[PDB]
Scaffold this motif. Structure first.
Motif, PDB file in Angstrom:
ATOM      1  N   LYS A   7      30.553  46.901  52.782  1.00  0.00           N
ATOM      2  CA  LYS A   7      30.574  47.654  54.028  1.00  0.00           C
ATOM      3  C   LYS A   7      31.044  49.086  53.718  1.00  0.00           C
ATOM      4  N   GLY A  35      33.154  44.627  62.548  1.00  0.00           N
ATOM      5  CA  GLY A  35      33.204  46.013  62.104  1.00  0.00           C
ATOM      6  C   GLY A  35      31.967  46.408  61.314  1.00  0.00           C
ATOM      7  N   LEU A  64      28.947  46.613  63.705  1.00  0.00           N
ATOM      8  CA  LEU A  64      29.138  47.876  64.434  1.00  0.00           C
ATOM      9  C   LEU A  64      28.617  49.103  63.644  1.00  0.00           C
ATOM     10  N   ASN A  65      29.049  49.244  62.385  1.00  0.00           N
ATOM     11  CA  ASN A  65      28.688  50.360  61.517  1.00  0.00           C
ATOM     12  C   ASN A  65      27.220  50.367  61.150  1.00  0.00           C
ATOM     13  N   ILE A  85      36.865  45.357  68.713  1.00  0.00           N
ATOM     14  CA  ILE A  85      35.575  45.733  68.142  1.00  0.00           C
ATOM     15  C   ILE A  85      34.442  45.427  69.107  1.00  0.00           C
ATOM     16  N   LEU A 130      34.086  48.259  71.417  1.00  0.00           N
ATOM     17  CA  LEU A 130      33.385  49.355  70.731  1.00  0.00           C
ATOM     18  C   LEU A 130      31.845  49.191  70.741  1.00  0.00           C
ATOM     19  N   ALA A 178      31.337  55.180  68.565  1.00  0.00           N
ATOM     20  CA  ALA A 178      32.421  54.567  67.814  1.00  0.00           C
ATOM     21  C   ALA A 178      31.888  53.898  66.582  1.00  0.00           C
ATOM     22  N   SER A 179      32.626  54.019  65.499  1.00  0.00           N
ATOM     23  CA  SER A 179      32.360  53.312  64.258  1.00  0.00           C
ATOM     24  C   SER A 179      33.621  52.463  64.100  1.00  0.00           C
ATOM     25  N   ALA A 180      33.594  51.499  63.177  1.00  0.00           N
ATOM     26  CA  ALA A 180      34.664  50.546  62.926  1.00  0.00           C
ATOM     27  C   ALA A 180      36.007  51.231  62.720  1.00  0.00           C
ATOM     28  N   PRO A 181      37.042  50.731  63.419  1.00  0.00           N
ATOM     29  CA  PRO A 181      38.366  51.336  63.279  1.00  0.00           C
ATOM     30  C   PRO A 181      39.054  50.899  61.983  1.00  0.00           C
TER      31      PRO A 181
END
Lengths: 227, 8, 225, 8
Positions: free
Chosen positions: A118, A167, A170-171, A215, A218, B3-6
């Motif tokens: 990632k 995460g 999401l990215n 997340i 988000l 938003a991207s991963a925190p």
């Protein structure tokens, strides 16, 4: 020796974090990684915190400069934006070099493998944000590959509520939307990830629940923005 | 902004 | 060129790249022309952000180092590295002030501005200094502040923000550096009282700046008394 | 923490 030197570098990185000296923290973490030992979950997080703060500062500056440059259409903005761009590229190349020569491994845990893959996708994505020609195409392909390998592992080895998995999805959805110009793939990926995590939230404990829901909020915010 | 991963 | 360096410093300010901003401003100052009020402020903003960052980091580390005693060597070594970087930034500012800015200053306002800046960076050096070096640094800060006070009392109104900010910093110097709490309280009270007597005559341009410093003088007095 | 002069 190496073990004592490594322990010192990790202590110094923890001190640099407290002092909010992220370039120092990154340098200590790079040195610690170069000793050759596997990073613990705490150490992976120190490395990630260090470089994400350095690159995050550079990306924000680059966006400011790039925005002024786009609006003003003298030579100073272009020259200065180029200087910031070069510094950002060097940080990304450092992270990517550490990932390829020390951290990315066939063994062991799917958690640590997905984590590093990632991270590889992320730093290639940061390079793609500022890249332009055929180089941009190569960078986009490299980010896509790192993310896809990580997605394949996370779908097979991690529950849909896992924060590393969340995460990552999401990215990768940010990558589809912003980099690969595939808004449909981005929306689809974000919806699926959110729905799959939503179906399993009741199985979580107060501690895990807060991690996953953060997340998911988000993913939901990005869907509001993209649809 | 999106938003991207925190941070972990 | 000078104009390019100033534009780049303004871009670095927008991008919040204060070390870049400081480097551009240093280069601009080294061209040899007097700085305008806007340029003085760019220079001040650049270096105060850099040194402010370093001072806060140094305070964090020094706090850990003290708690550690009841260690190890890492905190001392790292605190020393931060300290050396802070010392280099202060020495850079002080070098610019002595070789280009204080000498070439036209007006009394710019001279007070630069002399206050000189005492500030000597005061930052005094925060991390230890022996006979600390004593020399304390004397140099006292001397810069006093020269600035003498000029500001003769040339500026008691409500002027440069005058007020100078009196504030010099009183911080007395309390924290020179270990003279009585001089600090006295200076802060006098400055506040003299500004208070002229409050109704304050310039509209200085309303926000002067009243802020007046609030800070008052906050410090609440804390020190 | 005590206050010193703010930025111009």
């Amino acid at each position: 020796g190496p073990h004592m030197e490594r322990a010192s570098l990790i202590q110094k990185a923890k001190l640099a974090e407290q002092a909010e000296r992220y370039e120092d923290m990154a340098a200590f973490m790079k040195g610690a990684v170069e000793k050759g030992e596997e990073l613990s979950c705490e150490e992976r997080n120190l490395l990630s915190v260090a470089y994400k703060n350095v690159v995050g500062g550079q990306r924000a500056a680059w966006r400011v400069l790039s925005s002024i440059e786009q609006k003003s259409n003298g030579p100073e903005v272009r020259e200065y934006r180029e200087k910031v761009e070069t510094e950002l590229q060097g940080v990304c190349d450092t992270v990517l070099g550490l990932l390829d020569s020390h951290l990315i491994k066939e063994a062991g845990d799917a958690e640590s493998r997905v984590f590093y893959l990632k991270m590889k996708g992320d730093y290639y994505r940061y390079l793609a944000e500022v890249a332009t020609g055929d180089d941009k195409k190569r960078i986009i392909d490299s980010a896509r590959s790192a993310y896809q390998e990580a997605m394949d592992i996370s779908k097979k080895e991690m529950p849909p509520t896992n924060p590393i998995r969340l995460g990552l999805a999401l990215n990768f959805s940010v990558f589809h939307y912003e980099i690969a110009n595939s808004p449909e793939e981005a929306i689809s990926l974000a919806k699926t990830t959110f729905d799959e995590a939503m179906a399993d939230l009741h199985t979580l404990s107060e501690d895990s629940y807060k991690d996953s829901t953060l997340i998911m909020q988000l993913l939901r915010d990005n869907l509001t923005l993209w649809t | 902004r999106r938003a991207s991963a925190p941070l972990p």
